[PDB]
Amino acid sequence: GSPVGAAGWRVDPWIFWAKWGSGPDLGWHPLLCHMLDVAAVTLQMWRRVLPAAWKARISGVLGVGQEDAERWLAFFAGGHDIGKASPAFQLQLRPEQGRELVARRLRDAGLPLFNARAPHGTISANVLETVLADVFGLSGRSARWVAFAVGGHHGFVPSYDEVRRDLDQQAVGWGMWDAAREVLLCRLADALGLPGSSRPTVESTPDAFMLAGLVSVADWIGSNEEYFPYAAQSALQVPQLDAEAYLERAMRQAERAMASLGWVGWRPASGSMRLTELFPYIRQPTTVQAAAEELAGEVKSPSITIIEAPMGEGKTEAAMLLADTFSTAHGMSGCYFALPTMATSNQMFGRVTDYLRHRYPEDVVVVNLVHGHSDLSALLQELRQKGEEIFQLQGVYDEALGDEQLGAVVAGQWFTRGKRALLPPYGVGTVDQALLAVLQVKHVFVRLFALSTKTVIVDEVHAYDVYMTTLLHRLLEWLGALSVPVVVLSATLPSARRRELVKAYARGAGWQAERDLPPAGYPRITYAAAEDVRGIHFAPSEASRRKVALRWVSAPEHEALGQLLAEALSQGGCAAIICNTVPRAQALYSALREVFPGLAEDGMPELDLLHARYPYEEREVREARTLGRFSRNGRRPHRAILVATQVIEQSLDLDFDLMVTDLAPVDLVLQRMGRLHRHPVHDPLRPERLRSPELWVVSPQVMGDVPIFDRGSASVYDEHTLLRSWLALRDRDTLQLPEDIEELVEQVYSDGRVPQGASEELRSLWERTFKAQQKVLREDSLQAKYRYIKGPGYNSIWGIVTASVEEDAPELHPALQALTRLAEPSVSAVCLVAGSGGPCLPDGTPVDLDTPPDAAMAERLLRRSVAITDARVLDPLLDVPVPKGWERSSLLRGYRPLVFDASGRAMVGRWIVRIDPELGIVVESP
């Protein structure tokens, strides 16, 4: 019973606040200004950033024309903070920043005051779900969907009960507050020209869901005070503004901010280029590239493509040629390049840069070189490079963080951390960043939205990963719903995997056509579209036709391994030994120092070690040395040995005369084997003993016929898979490539239960390990409701994510990533030295843990960073609090100080942790 009189309808919109300053900044930003800012950011996104296919698709989903869909999207995005016009939010002010002035200001307007609290986004959902219908004429489902999606902007879309049951009425207010919000919303809509345009339809769940990500990003752009200064110079006075002129200035500011981010202006300027043109360095295209070039002329706008060729065949140029065809011919301006988990992004960027120069004006040089990167080195150089190049946020009022500056920090991690690579139209990063889009994590919809504008290339997919997890399948479903073109690259996939992946993308795209996948010989390119489903075989390159000698080194021989290496390398040659874990690599290297004490031509020892567990600058040094020795253009040593973990297995473009590896799932052993004699140019200079390729696998202890895998390998990989791999490999003397790649992988995963007629204990090991594996998969399937987001076909906008909603901000990497086995759980730590006056840099300045670092000091700290993953110290390290200055820093939030003494020792739980100049971080028992 709240009849508002005309005096109540008067109100004056500008009195309400959305942002407020703290200390040096005494000013504040009116809510109508903020809504106009986010709407302006949305308009400029529509006009200068978003790819044409995305605009056409979303306009079609909305059922209206493009200008109309644009103005309405700007309306919803601007309307994201309408819930701030409540007593609960307006009264939030600190007394020292003038809460009383605002209180008198609202009291003069006749607005009732209540001290009840509620997050403003939930309030926004609660008001929009009715007002968007009763006033603006949207259907109730449309109003509801927009209300929830828009109301989720701070991290999670609200649960149904939060909006429609558990929300206190005093927090929202009614009568006068409804009239005030109606006035703000109407002035917003009039500023964007909504009357009397045709009403949009927003009843598609997946689309509303990623649109929430668009809203969050537009709010982040609107939160940069450098580009969006607060309109009110003081708490004492209310600005007298014109909404239209302010919208114009807001549009200029939005264009400037996004220009600073490098989001403009990627105009393809067609164009219609062949593969030799985009990649001049190649002479004769490889057969896979030729088949892709032939495929390119008929590819459909929403489609999935799977490319299976032996490693070194150049699948990436084919993939990029396809993405280029998508951008030029199908309006998909943009691409995310999803590199393998262990892979560093580093070597890959330059290729993308070169492709960009051949398609875009040299403005590329001003943009991607800073922005498409996710590697830490780009962040370091960007920090060293004056001026303040890092985009910065303030006044992000996240409900479940202590304060708005903390919310601004957590939101600004999107411009500091590796996930930043998602944002730009072109970006290169880890596949994990894309895979997170289907986890129940904060701002998943932001990841769905960032992916929604690009074609997606998944580099180096392994059979083991698509067998052990469903992450890629789910992501493919969501990508299919959002009409995102996808190219998956792999050395080989079992047919069941190709089928389930293509079926996942098709299931997401709604392709009701059910007709079968066409079988084709390896190597091959599978392809699928609406009316089209192809399977194209092509001939392997003659260079791919090799015989690889296979050799086992058993447990009794395992310390003769140094001797076997000595005889094999007596005439020199480059050799690599891939261990499955860091401790195994450190141990093997330490054992190997006696056998190879010599110095290489680069002035560094011929024996070398490479793994991720080093402070980052040391990683840079060791990696530069490794690339310097074993890369295709590198100065190849007469003799060198590299002990390394799987960071070599998936990243660097290396070539070795001899390969040794721990037993692993066969696709991974083959992937490691792809570095063996990788570059033909090195052939003439190879030592005579090593001219015929050889793969040594370290044999497990064998009791009778029953293998006993080492604990580290058993912990890293599924043991049944290790067993199947060992069974498939043990009798072999010679591998016949290309064909043995697909043959071995198909044998290990795809189907055959082959005990082969052996001991009862071996059979028991088979059945037991298989039972454990299946129990793991089944347990992940039953627990899926607590881990994965709902698929695209889910009935309602609410409940796509349920728990731990708005915590905030819940993992993410330490927890959910591990349970879904997206990646190993880990702790980020900064290595420092002990001393009075607190922790120090190694040379030798004191560190202030109590205050956030400046960009230079943060650069120095990040140089000391390392990602600990060893299980023994992981928990005790997490028990160490993140220092209060670091938690208020977007650059260093989540990092843990790790203070070694003068001896390089530090106590961590029951364990000694040691910083070794040769070994890197070493965990050992006292």
Question: Two tokens at 619?
Answer: 């990683």
Closest CA to 864 of 901, 838, 890, 892: 892
Q: Is 331 annotated as a binding residue?
A: no
Give the integer Cα–Cα distance in Å for 835 and 899. Answer: 9
The residue type at 267: R
**Shortest approach of Ni ion to residue 806 CB, angstroms?**
12
Q: What are phi and psi of 654, to 5 degrees?
A: -110, 160
**Shortest approach of Ni ion to residue 404 CB, angstroms?**
8
Q: Is 94 annotated as a binding residue?
A: no
Give the integer Cα–Cα distance in Å for 381 and 864. Answer: 15
Is the separation of the CB atoms in 588 and 581 below 8 Å?
no
**Shortest approach of Ni ion to residue 400 CB, angstroms?**
12
* Cβ distance to Ni ion smaller for residue 154 or 359: 154
Is the separation of the CB atoms in 905 and 923 below 8 Å?
no
Q: Is 316 annotated as a binding residue?
A: yes
* Cβ distance to Ni ion smaller for residue 86 or 769: 86
DSSP one-letter string for 638-681: SEEEEEE-THHHHTS-B-BSEEEEE---HHHHHHHHTTBT--GG
**Shortest approach of Ni ion to residue 228 CB, angstroms?**
11
Q: Is 675 annotated as a binding residue?
A: yes
* CB contact set of 466 (below 8 Å; sequence gap of 6+): 472, 473, 493, 497, 500, 501
* Cβ distance to Ni ion smaller for residue 403 or 824: 403
* Cβ distance to Ni ion smaller for residue 16 or 266: 16
Helix ranges (DSSP H) in 49-139: 52-62, 66-78, 87-90, 99-108, 120-134
Q: Is 289 annotated as a binding residue?
A: yes
Is the separation of the CB atoms in 81 and 131 below 8 Å?
no
* Cβ distance to Ni ion smaller for residue 219 or 623: 219
Give the integer Cα–Cα distance in Å for 801 and 787. Answer: 9
Helix ranges (DSSP H) in 493-615: 495-509, 561-568, 582-592
**Shortest approach of Ni ion to residue 55 CB, angstroms?**
24
The residue type at 838: G
- Write out the residues near Ni ion by the rule CB under 5 A: 81, 219, 397
**Shortest approach of Ni ion to residue 625 CB, angstroms?**
47
CA–CA–CA angle 666, 814, 888 (5° rounding) = 140
Relative orientation angle of helices 666-673 and 739-748, to the nearest 10 degrees:
160
H/E stretch holding 308 reads strand 304-308
**Shortest approach of Ni ion to residue 230 CB, angstroms?**
13
Q: What are phi and psi of 664, to 5 degrees?
A: -155, 175
* Cβ distance to Ni ion smaller for residue 219 or 608: 219
**Shortest approach of Ni ion to residue 181 CB, angstroms?**
14
* Cβ distance to Ni ion smaller for residue 172 or 668: 172
Q: Is 817 annotated as a binding residue?
A: no
Give the integer Cα–Cα distance in Å for 148 and 799. Answer: 10
**Shortest approach of Ni ion to residue 85 CB, angstroms?**
12
Q: Which long-range contacts (CB under 8 A, 24 or more apart) does 808-815 make?
A: 808/154, 808/155, 808/156, 808/398, 808/399, 808/400, 808/401, 808/410, 808/442, 809/155, 809/398, 809/400, 809/401, 809/410, 809/442, 810/441, 810/442, 811/441, 812/436, 812/439, 812/441, 812/442, 814/878
* Cβ distance to Ni ion smaller for residue 89 or 336: 89
**Shortest approach of Ni ion to residue 153 CB, angstroms?**
6
Taking the mean position of all CA atoms in its chain, how far away is CA 451? 10
CA–CA–CA angle 874, 878, 883 (5° rounding) = 140
CA–CA–CA angle 684, 690, 695 (5° rounding) = 130
* Cβ distance to Ni ion smaller for residue 25 or 617: 25
**Shortest approach of Ni ion to residue 154 CB, angstroms?**
5
* Cβ distance to Ni ion smaller for residue 136 or 397: 397
Closest CA to 742 of 522, 536, 500: 522
**Shortest approach of Ni ion to residue 65 CB, angstroms?**
28
* Cβ distance to Ni ion smaller for residue 215 or 647: 215
Give the integer Cα–Cα distance in Å for 450 and 461. Answer: 21
Q: Is 312 annotated as a binding residue?
A: yes
Is the separation of the CB atoms in 481 and 205 below 8 Å?
no
* Cβ distance to Ni ion smaller for residue 31 or 320: 31
Residue 860 vs residues 377, 621, 701, 841: alpha-carbon distances, Å: 12, 16, 46, 8
H/E stretch holding 412 reads helix 404-416
3-class DSSP string for 731-764 = CCCEEECCHHHHHHHHHHCCCCCCCCCCCHHHHH
**Shortest approach of Ni ion to residue 158 CB, angstroms?**
12
**Shortest approach of Ni ion to residue 411 CB, angstroms?**
9
Is the separation of the CB atoms in 342 and 67 below 8 Å?
no
In three-state secondary structure terms, 233 is: coil
Sheet arrangement for strand 694-698: 607-610, 639-644, 573-578, 658-662, 694-698, 547-553, 734-736
* Cβ distance to Ni ion smaller for residue 78 or 637: 78
Q: Is 653 annotated as a binding residue?
A: yes
* Cβ distance to Ni ion smaller for residue 81 or 710: 81
**Shortest approach of Ni ion to residue 127 CB, angstroms?**
13
* Cβ distance to Ni ion smaller for residue 239 or 687: 239
In three-state secondary structure terms, 890 is: coil
Q: What is the DSSP letter of 599?
A: B
Binding-site residues, please?
Answer: 286, 289, 312, 314-316, 351, 653, 671, 675, 678
Binding-site residues for dATP, please?
Answer: 286, 289, 312, 314-316, 351, 653, 671, 675, 678
